Amino acid sequence: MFINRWLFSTNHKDIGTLYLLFGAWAGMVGTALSLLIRAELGQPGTLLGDDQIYNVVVTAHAFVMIFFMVMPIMIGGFGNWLVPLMIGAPDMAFPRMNNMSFWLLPPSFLLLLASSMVEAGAGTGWTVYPPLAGNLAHAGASVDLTIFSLHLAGVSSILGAINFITTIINMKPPAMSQYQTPLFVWSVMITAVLLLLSLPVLAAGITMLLTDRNLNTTFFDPAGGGDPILYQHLFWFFGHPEVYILILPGFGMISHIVTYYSGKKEPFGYMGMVWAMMSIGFLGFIVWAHHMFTVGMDVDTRAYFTSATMIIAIPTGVKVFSWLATLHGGNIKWSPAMMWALGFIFLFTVGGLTGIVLANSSLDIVLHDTYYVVAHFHYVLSMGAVFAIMGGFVHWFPLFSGYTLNDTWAKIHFAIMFVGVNMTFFPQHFLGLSGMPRRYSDYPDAYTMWNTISSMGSFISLTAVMLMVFIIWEAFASKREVLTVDLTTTNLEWLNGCPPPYHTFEEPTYVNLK
Amino acid sequence: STALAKPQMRGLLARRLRFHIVGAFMVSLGFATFYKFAVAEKRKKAYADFYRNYDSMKDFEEMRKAGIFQSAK
Amino acid sequence: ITAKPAKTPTSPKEQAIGLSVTFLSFLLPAGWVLYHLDNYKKS
Amino acid sequence: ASGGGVPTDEEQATGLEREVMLAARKGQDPYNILAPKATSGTKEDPNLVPSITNKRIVGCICEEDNSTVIWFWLHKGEAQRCPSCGTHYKLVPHQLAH
Amino acid sequence: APDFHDKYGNAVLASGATFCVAVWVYMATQIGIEWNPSPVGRVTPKEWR
Amino acid sequence: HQTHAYHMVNPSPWPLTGALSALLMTSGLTMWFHFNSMTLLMIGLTTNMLTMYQWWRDVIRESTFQGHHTPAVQKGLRYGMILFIISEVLFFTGFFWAFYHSSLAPTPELGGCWPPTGIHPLNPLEVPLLNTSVLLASGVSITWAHHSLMEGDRKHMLQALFITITLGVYFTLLQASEYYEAPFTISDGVYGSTFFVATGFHGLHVIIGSTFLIVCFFRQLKFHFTSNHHFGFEAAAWYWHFVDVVWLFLYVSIYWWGS
Amino acid sequence: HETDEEFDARWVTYFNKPDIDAWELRKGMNTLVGYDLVPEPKIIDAALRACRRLNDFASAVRILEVVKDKAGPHKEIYPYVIQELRPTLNELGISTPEELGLDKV
Amino acid sequence: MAYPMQLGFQDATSPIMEELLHFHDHTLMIVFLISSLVLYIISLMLTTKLTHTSTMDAQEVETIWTILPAIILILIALPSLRILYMMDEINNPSLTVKTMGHQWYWSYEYTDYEDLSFDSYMIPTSELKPGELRLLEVDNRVVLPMEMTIRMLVSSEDVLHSWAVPSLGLKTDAIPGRLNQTTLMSSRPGLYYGQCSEICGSNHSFMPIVLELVPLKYFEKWSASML
Amino acid sequence: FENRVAEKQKLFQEDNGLPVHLKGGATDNILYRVTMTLCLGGTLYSLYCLGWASFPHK
Amino acid sequence: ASAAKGDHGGTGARTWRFLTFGLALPSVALCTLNSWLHSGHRERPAFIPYHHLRIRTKPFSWGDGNHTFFHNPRVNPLPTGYEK
Amino acid sequence: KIKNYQTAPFDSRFPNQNQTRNCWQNYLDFHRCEKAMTAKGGDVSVCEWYRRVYKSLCPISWVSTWDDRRAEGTFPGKI
Amino acid sequence: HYEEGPGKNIPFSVENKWRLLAMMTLFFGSGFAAPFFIVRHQLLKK
Amino acid sequence: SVVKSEDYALPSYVDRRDYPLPDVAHVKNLSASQKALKEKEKASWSSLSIDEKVELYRLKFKESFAEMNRSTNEWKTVVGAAMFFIGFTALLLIWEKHYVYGPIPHTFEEEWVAKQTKRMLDMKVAPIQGFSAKWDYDKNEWKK
Ligand code: HEA
Ligand SMILES: CCCCC/C=C\C/C=C\C/C=C\C/C=C\CCCC(=O)O[C@H](COC(=O)CCCCCCCCCCCCCCCCC)COP(=O)(O)OCCN
Ligand SMILES: CCCCC/C=C/C/C=C/CCCCCCCC(=O)O[C@H](COC(=O)CCCCCCCCCCCCCCC)COP(=O)(O)OCC[N+](C)(C)C
Ligand SMILES: CCCCCCCCCCO[C@@H]1O[C@H](CO)[C@@H](O[C@H]2O[C@H](CO)[C@@H](O)[C@H](O)[C@H]2O)[C@H](O)[C@H]1O
Ligand SMILES: CCCCCCCCCCO[C@@H]1O[C@H](CO)[C@@H](O[C@H]2O[C@H](CO)[C@@H](O)[C@H](O)[C@H]2O)[C@H](O)[C@H]1O
Ligand SMILES: C[C@H](CCC(=O)O)[C@H]1CC[C@H]2[C@@H]3[C@H](O)C[C@@H]4C[C@H](O)CC[C@]4(C)[C@H]3C[C@H](O)[C@]12C
Ligand code: CUA
Ligand SMILES: [Mg+2]
Ligand code: NA
Ligand SMILES: [Zn+2]
């Protein structure tokens, strides 16, 4: 029974739970790597070794947080648990293929841990640019193990995207149009279309890197007429959509959490929120060379990528102001999930505004490849994707488990993590403006004060991550069983109770047309 | 005894919002004035003042006599 | 949300134990590696 | 130019596929493929909600084009009302043999 | 009935604040951390050449 | 008992065996490229092939033999297949992008010209034009197969499907022969890299497509298809037209414009 | 759309329906408190008389607590509404939440 | 170079850097103000027991919150793109200097007249002379004439690097097989420092750039002496 | 050839509680075990190969 | 462009069989003649050890590491020229 | 003709940040000119301008590799 | 069927809170310790 | 009374100020005296005692508005515990400095810093605003 239920699953809730467990374990790997980074940097000089071991830690930090923590938790964990329930479907369209998307991830993570054990690791940056990642400067198996880890994670998500798009399009009640599905379901659908179109282009690019490393092709080697810059275009053609894939399910959860704890039946401006997510998904494919403003591109190309990148602020601003309009007039319930969502709104807005600074290429010439970029994206990732995840996890934990957390401990955990991440990242803006580069294991002495404070911040967030583990243990150790939940008439995933039976919607909902 | 007067009972949330969005704006214009004054204008004036009578050869000679250069003793 | 009282209440002492074990499970193994870095490096 | 040898669905469909094809031929919808048309929804003329058990979830799109659907369990017994618009629904249980 | 916060909230707030200030002051001032502050108004420049 | 039309699949070992096959194939290629050994890679190819066979066998059991493909299930599988094709089109777009990037702006190492100095392209009017006629013809004959099947004509469905597969095989053997005859190789700079990796993944897909048509041929021989229900044949026909359209773009781009 | 008077008149009529049932009384009050207003005395009086027809003393008390709540920090509103309702409270024998000690935390 | 506790950009050494500082100030106030407007509008939504929970009409307010951001973006983009096309204008350099990136140091070639080239490596910390800056100084500085337009061309002979000097507003990637151009003009003499700005392996943190800006006649005699 | 799909429909619809991947009978069990053994065995071998490859061979 | 062919008003298999045997297979037969007329070996060009060709940055994982996968001795020189 | 050569002037054929083709074209033009002279017995001094421009712009290692490859018979540009 | 309900829809047992504490310590502690041991490994090599 | 996990699909009781009349009564089963008090409620409410009216309220509802909306001392516990664990963090940082970090580079020695500072002033590092601007080159001291 154990093996049939957990290794042979065809059930969306149990596969969802598999992905949340996987994602939590990866989150501890990515946290440790982040503390190794901040230990290296937390005083001047060398702690671990030179930039090779250091950038192996940095590279793995990114890949683990992106591909093994955030994507599995938002799309495989919350998407699998919530999407079928929110549309009254009895499971995903392809329940067995859904289980292979899950099981591709432990092999993909194994490959990445293999890359770091063999030779001297892949110390390439998560962008894996050649020629540093090619077979002369990174001879031996480490970068090929990295490429194959990304191939497996890519197939897992491409097949996941097919599953979600099909389920969302085909498995709603016959009366429900796509304009009567909840915002989280639209956020998963749009993220899945972004995955479907962007991951195959990354697959093409890293396959070309694999053949340049092992079959004597020269796609990116000028000796054969190749160009290292072509790899950058193909990687970033996927990498920009990838950041919107990381955040969109987060925006979908934030809309539900803000609506729910404002005591509202609906988010403000539902069709504006759908329009904003499709516009950000479409615009997110025509901006990628904002990662390439110092590579030597033409001036008119730099002008178009500056303008197109900026334009994304318009639909994004619609959603921020709509979340404010949803709080407007609410019966505000100051639950710990609500705190996470309010931290999200503020910290995402900070990071989006420093993104707007960077979109100006002439200023990005000075800010590129410095810590100002690191500060921009950790305000949207560590203080947007993570805070949306922690919001959704504390909100829906009683649905998944049937048990309640202690809300006082969860508020304490939010307070420690909010201090910790702002201590860590806020000073990196000053380090970036004054010129400290990225991917450095040590810095000129003038940069010491802000690196010291940033490192001290990272330990406060470590204390929060340890306390989170204790808070989950305490809930399972005390077994306070859920009785009633508020607002089920506009939150269908709760209406089958906590946790819902293994099979739900065996008899579909009744929805009439009129 | 005296009756109480009837108070306003309707649109109280909207009235509070109207009042404060305007005070939210008035701050932004009043902060803009200070941030322009304290940082941006100050910078323009620091650069204009520095270069007004700046003598680059005199600056070079001071550096040269302090022994900073490889190319000039 | 409303919920039943705990089926298996975790007293303050028991929370102190779970919190300490949890913090030690992260702190001790990393602490052991970092304490011994000079040893690994000088080889 | 042409001949036969290819089975038809009438000959060879089986299991649920056959059930759905035979029910459709009779104008019946036991597997809930079609959206039900609403009645005027008053207490005299409630929406009739079929079920194989003692309760079924209803979603009420109270006005055309609302994006918010209102969900609630409808139980066997007296008609119940949507808690947003009040339109009435009544469960009609039984079997899987309509 | 009074709950955990009514009975212990004042003590938790006062001791946690006291402890947090004490240990951060000690860490920041007593254990040899080099903050590298600005030399401006602090350092007397010395001949180097 | 459910009263929706969707398929609750029985719990299955194939997703796990497919996932492990992928670990064995990729760790296998790593051992082949770096540790001089093919062992792990043949174990992974074998288990990948076993997994595909049993999984798709099970889909035929579930559909043809157990009746779980109601119209709602079939409509999902339509979307699934269209989305899969779209992702394969984007995978080839990355190779076309690499081709045009390198050929539109040839660097000094190549002679600052396309084709590079020292490269002698195949003549596009010879075996490449033949391969074009072969795949176009096979798009006509699969269309005949589809109409015969809808018209309930078993014999002409099989005759047209066999013709389509024979042409698939003819293209594959013609390509294998052109690869052997070609005076440039995958190591001949970015011209050989683009040429062989883009036409080589296309050839892999012609092999996959042809395999899928052969599966449809044996299922048709076994009477699995009805004149109205035959999604496996439709999906293989859609994949086959995709392989033909990709060839047309490769022929115009790499063989013709790039000669 | 409508004037404040027309809005008020529609709610007075809603609650004045002689055979209003329990479901309709609760739907009406739980809908009305969603609006940006504290209901006029004349609406509350009609809801309280509906409580009487429905033999529900406790819901009449809860309605007076929701008036107080809807006023938020405008502490002058509730004492004014209780003033305006005193004739009806005395006629129906409705004690206020304060007279019952139900304002004590 | 940066100094301890620094918050903003290094002071401007070139007119283009000056322009960037003023454009940054213009942009940051916006950033300030939007951040502040949001934080504030947020705390306004969260500080009242009054409620209004029924459906709210969105069309009017969405016009405000699409059009006002669009105007703000245009107010940032106008000066932004003016600077972009300014830096791109033709300027007639007096000298061309090449730099090639390597693992891990830079070489410099000044080949307008003679064959002058040399390598430039970080001074190891154990060999710094008193007063010299840890990880910043180099053995052989890139001497250049002040107050003159200089064309720098940048490339690499191995992996990617990127050649940066923050106080001149410069960062140009160093890509093998490619020759990227930038211009450089210092308003003042002095020593202007930068650091390799694309991850390039084990000693990426330790291959800095130091420009030494002096009068033309000093530069000429230094050039002759370096042959 | 003859159309024996009705035969297979009876085989795969028999009420024997078998999952579909074992419902064809004992040959399914054999092919399942062969596949699972090669997958788990190969996975152990791949871990051995990581062990080997994690250390210098000098 | 309609093509130059031309029909409808009924449908399906019969027409697509007519296109298969009347247009598609004929075209394949014609191209097959065209190819098997320009077939047979062309005189290979002088070997020149161009540095953008015969790339070797890592030995191939088969053979002696220096031969491409479908190496043809007649027309594929090694980095040191044609085989003996 | 135009001595007091300081460095290579702006060339509208190559107005963007990538100057690779500027170096290559001048290198070709020089060597093409020098072949055209010498051959026809005329004077290589007329090719001087291309020489000064490519020496200014081209990395030493590119010039050195291209000169090695001309000597080896493996230079892929047409001269 | 399978077990349903709180504590039964998970691949780990919560029947005893101390055995659970041990399993959660092993699970999250192994993920957090791994990169420190990998770094130790890369340092010991050379 | 007693809410069971198995009643999740039934209408339920809730105290919240925005849904004042919940879907069921707080107590539905009545004792003999409670049945007599519900009959008495059919007559004039002026004849109910204050206790009877409170008993009827508490059969229909669990908490009053004043009760359900009460403020609490939880913030003291949250802020104090957060300070505690931020304080615990500085123990970790003390431990790391003592056992993990070695001596930082010799360029941070007081005499090095004084010499480096004068050399920064001699090269006029940031002379417009950031560094040398704050030095008085006439009086040879930091500007006031
Ligand atoms: C969640 C992921 C996410 C999001 C949403 C964004 C959003 C934006 N980002 Fe960024 N970005 C990253 C993740 C993301 N980014 C990552 C991961 C990298 C680098 C990774 C690496 O290099 O390793 C990066 C790098 C990056 C760069 C390259 C910097 C460089 O490397 O030199 C640039 C430059 O244009 C940029 C710009 C922006 C802009 C303009 C936005 C805007 O879309 C933000 C829009 C949002 C707001 C402005 C806030 C809310 C809006 C309002 C309140 C409306 C009104 C306001 C205005 C009209 C201004 N980002
Ligand atoms: C009709 C053609 C069909 C191809 C059949 C031939 C063998 C392999 C089949 C797979 C083809 C797929 C493309 C992979 C890349 C290279 C093969 C290109 C096609 C080919 O076969 O190229 C040959 C070279 O093959 C070589 O190196 C061969 C090296 C063989 C190893 C393949 C390497 C592994 C590829 C990794 C794939 C990763 C894919 C990721 C999926 C993405 C996830 C979303 C050309 O021979 P040549 O002697 O150089 O020149 C001819 C001279 N007379
Ligand atoms: C670049 C930066 C941009 C920043 C932009 C910020 C813009 C702020 C704009 C202000 C909007 C003004 C609306 C005030 C609403 C507050 C609550 C309220 O006051 O509720 C009511 C308003 O709601 C109605 O219906 C009318 C509309 C429906 C409900 C209310 C909708 C508006 C709420 C929007 C709140 C925005 C809050 C945060 C913004 C970031 C008031 O009652 P009425 O007299 O109309 O009833 C009469 C009944 N009728 C309709 C039948 C006639
Ligand atoms: C980046 C995340 C980690 C952050 C901080 C970790 C905080 C430290 C937890 C303590 O870890 C332990 O510390 C002891 C020292 O206090 C070590 O004992 C060492 O030192 C003792 C005292 O010198 C000897 O008795 C022991 O044998 C010797 O192992 C011990 O191995 C290590 O587990
Ligand atoms: C449950 C079923 C699935 C599990 C199967 C597990 C299989 C384990 C067998 C592997 O052993 C072999 O050892 C060979 C000989 O020792 C190796 O050849 C390698 O090493 C040789 C000796 O140095 C070289 O000569 C070879 O060329 C080189 O390929 C090669 O790695 C591998 O074939
Ligand atoms: C044996 C069978 C009669 C088919 C049936 O059971 O109806 C016939 C019908 C169509 C025939 C096939 C088609 O005519 C196409 C092919 C023609 C080749 O000459 C023989 C193999 C070939 C693939 C045929 C084999 C066999 O004779 C088939 C399969
Ligand atoms: Cu060179 Cu980084
Ligand atoms: Mg860069
Ligand atoms: Na360091
Ligand atoms: Zn309704």
DSSP state letters, F88-140: HHHHHHHHHHHHHHHHHS--GGGTSSSSPTT--PPPTTSHHHHHHHHHHHHHH
Give the resolution to one decimal, in Å: 1.6
Task: Tally the domains of chain A.
Answer: 1
Q: What does the buried/exposed string (b/e) look like for M68-93 if buried means 16 or more CB atoms within 10 Å of the residue's CB?
A: eeeeebbebbbbbbbbbbbbbbbebb
Which residues in chain B have their CB less than 8 angstroms from residue M124's CB?
A: 59, 62-63
> Do F116 and J52 contact (CB within 8 A), yes or no?
yes
For CATH 1.10.287.90, the residue range(s) in chain H are: 2-91
Domains, chain M:
1-144 (1.10.442.10)
Q: How far apart are CA G20 and CA G37, in angstroms?
A: 23
Which amino acid, residue H212? Answer: E
Taking a C-beta distance cutoff of 8 angstroms, is the pair A145, A124 a contact?
no
Find all residues with CB under 8 Å of A111, minimum gap 6, and list them: A145, A146, A148, A149, A152, F23, F26, F27
Last residue of a domain, one of F43, F68, F93: F68
Q: What residues contact B46, with CB distance under 8 A and at least 6 apart?
A: M128, M129, M133
- Ramachandran region, residue A233 (left: φ > 0; alpha: ψ -120 to 50; beta: rest): alpha
Task: Please state the domain count of chain F.
Answer: 2
Closest CA to A176 of D91, D32, M120, M131: D32
Query: For M14, which residue in chain A has the nearest alpha carbon?
Result: A486
Distance from C-alpha of A490 to C-alpha of A493, rounded to nearest angstrom = 9
Of residues F189, F106, A208, the one with CA closest to residue J54 = F189
Give the domain range for residue I1: 1-58
Locate A176 and state its tokens.
Answer: 């429900």
By the 8 A CB rule, do F122 and F191 touch?
A: no
CA end-to-end distance (rounded Å), chain M: 75
Task: Tell me if A228 sits within 8 A of A220, measured CB to CB.
Answer: yes
3-state class (DSSP) for residue A443: coil
Residue H217's CB is within 10 A of a number of other CB atoms, namely: 10
Name beta bridge partners: G63: none
Domain membership of residue F15 as a residue range: 1-68
- Please report, in range form, the residues annotated as the binding site of D for Zn(2+): 60, 62, 82, 85
In chain J, the domains with their CATH numbers are 1-84 (4.10.95.10)
Of M87, M98, M116, the CB nearest to E31: M98
Distance from CA of F3 to the nearest CA of J (A): 38
Q: Does H78 lie at the interface with E, CB-CB under 8 angstroms?
A: no
Q: At what angle do helices F14-34 and A141-170 cross, to 10 degrees?
A: 150
Mode of pairing for the β-strands spanning D88-93 and H95-102: unpaired
The CATH number given to whatever domain includes residue G21 is 1.25.40.40
Q: Is M86 in the pocket of ligand 4 (CB under 6 A)?
A: no
Type of residue numbered E49: R
What residues pair up with A482 in beta bridges, in sequence order? C3
Overall residue count recorded for chain D in this entry? 98
The two structure tokens encoding residue D81:
């009302």
Q: Give the closest residue to M115 by CA, choosing from B67, E43, A448, H190.
A: E43
CB H193 within 8 A of CB H133: yes
How many alpha carbons fall within 13 Å on the CB side of residue A3? 4
Contacts of B6 in chain G (CB under 8 A): 80
Q: Show the domains of chain C with their CATH numbers.
A: 1-43 (4.10.81.10)
Note the ligand closest to the C-alpha atom of A367. 1
> DSSP of D71-88, one letter per residue?
EEEEESSS-EE-TTT--E
CA gap A69, A54 in Å, rounded: 21
CA distances from H21 to F178, H75, H82 (A): 61, 16, 14
**Residues A26 and A77 sit within 8 Å (Cβ to Cβ):** no
Range of the domain at A145: 2-514
Q: Which residue has the tokens 């055309």?
A: D64
Q: Are E20 and M87 in contact (CB under 8 A)?
A: yes
Count CB-CB contacts under 10 A for residue K51: 18
Residues with CB under 6 A from ligand 2: A 151, 154-155, 158, 203, 207, 210-211, 215; F 29, 172, 175-176, 179-180, 182, 185-186, 196-197, 200-201, 203-204; J 68-72, 76
Q: How was this structure determined?
A: X-ray
Chain M residues within 8 A of A39 when measuring between CB atoms: 96, 100
Residue H180's DSSP bridge partners are: H154, K18
Instruction: Let me know: does D1 contact F147? Beta carbons within 8 Å.
Output: no
SS3 content of chain F, % helix, strand, coil (to 5): 75, 0, 25
Name the β-bridge partners of H24: none
CA–CA distance from B31 to each of B24, B36, F102, H33 (Å)? 11, 8, 53, 8
The fold adopted by the segment(s) H92-227 is Immunoglobulin-like (2.60.40)
| List of E strands, chain H | 95-102, 105-110, 116-120, 142-145, 150-156, 161-165, 170-174, 180-184, 190-195, 208-214
The whole-angstrom separation of Cα A289 and Cα K14 is: 22
Q: How far is CA A126 from the centre of its chain?
A: 14
What total number of domains does chain K contain?
Answer: 1
Q: Do A229 and H175 meet the contact criterion of CB atoms below 8 Å apart? A: yes
Domain that holds residue B25: 2-73
First to last CA, chain E: 76
DSSP A107-140: HHHHHHHHHHHSTT---STTTT-TTTTSTTTS-S
Count of domains for chain B: 1
> Please, which residues have CB within 8 angstroms of residue A484's CB and are 6 or more apart in sequence?
C1, C2, M3, M8, M12, M13, M14
Chains in touch with F (≥3 Cβ pairs < 8 A): A, D, I, J, K
Neighbours of I26 (CB within 10 A): 8
* Residues A440/H122, Cβ–Cβ less than 8 Å: no
Looking at residue B53, which CATH number applies to its domain? 4.10.93.10
| Alpha-carbon span C13 to G20, nearest angstrom | 56
Element (H, E) at M135: strand M135-136
DSSP per-residue string spanning M47-115: GS-HHHHHHHHHHH-SS-HHHHT---SHHHHHHHHHHHHHHHHHHHHHHHHHHT-----GGGSHHHHHH
A44:E34 CB<8 A: yes
The beta-strand segments (E) located in chain D are 47-51, 55-60, 70-75, 80-81, 88-93
Instruction: Report the CATH number that the domain containing residue A203 is assigned in CATH.
Output: 1.20.210.10
The number of domains in chain I is 1
Contact A358, A294 (CB under 8 A): no
Where on the phi/psi map is residue I25: left (φ > 0), alpha (ψ -120 to 50), or beta? left
Respond yes or no on whether the N-terminal peptide bond of residue H104 is cis (omega within 30° of 0). yes
Stretch (H or E) spanning A511: strand A510-511
Instruction: Tell me the two tokens of residue L44.
Output: 């010991």
* F242: nearest Cα among F80, F49, F90: F90
H200 known member of a binding site: yes
Show which residues of A are catalytic.
61, 91, 126, 156-157, 240, 242, 244, 255, 290-291, 316, 319, 438
CA distance to partner chain M, nearest, from residue D22 (Å): 34
d(CA H57, CA D84): 18
DSSP H or E run through M136: strand M135-136
Q: What is the sign, positive or negative, of the torsion defined by CA atoms of G29, G33, G36, G37?
A: positive
- Which residue has 């859920």 as its token pair? A482
Distance CA(A35)–CA(A56), nearest Å, equals 14
* CA–centroid distance for H172 within its chain: 9
Dihedral sign, Cα of residue A289, residue A290, residue A291, residue A295: positive
Q: Domains plus CATH for chain L?
A: 1-46 (4.10.49.10)
CATH class of H2-91: mainly alpha
Beta bridge partners of H96: H151
Please name the helix (run of DSSP H) or strand (run of DSSP E) that holds residue M141, with its range, or none.
strand M141-142
Range of the domain at E9: 1-49
String of DSSP letters for J7-51: --SS-SHHHHHHHIIIIIHHHHHHHHHHHTTS-S---PPPP---T
Q: Which two tokens stand for residue I52?
A: 């080997």
- Cα–Cα dist A440/A438, whole Å: 6
Measure D88 CA to ligand 10 centroid, in angstroms: 9
Superfamily holding D1-98: Cytochrome c oxidase, subunit Vb (2.60.11.10)
Q: What is the DSSP letter of A79?
A: I
Rg (CA), chain C: 19
Question: Widest CA span of chain K, in angstroms?
Answer: 39
Cα of F163 from ligand 6 centre, angstroms: 11
Contact A130, A209 (CB under 8 A): yes
Amino acid at L28: F
Phi–psi pair at M109, nearest 5 degrees: -65, 145
- Give the sign of the dihedral formed by CA H127, CA H133, CA H134, CA H136: negative
3-state SS assignment for residue F141: helix
Q: What type of residue is D63?
A: E
Q: Which amino acid is it at H95?
A: L
Which strand ranges, in their side-by-side order, compose the sheet holding D70-75? A510-511, D55-60, D70-75
Residue M43, number of CB atoms within 10 A of its CB: 11
Residues of F in contact with I35 (CB under 8 A): 13, 17, 47, 50-51, 54
Burial class (CB in 10 A: 0-12, 13-18, 19+), K43: exposed
Beta bridge partners of residue G37, listed in sequence order:
B10
Show binding-site residues of A.
40, 45, 61, 240, 244, 290-291, 368-369, 376, 378, 441
User: What residue numbers bound the domain in which G32 lies?
Assistant: 1-105
Q: Is the dihedral of CA L35, L41, L44, L45 positive or negative?
A: negative
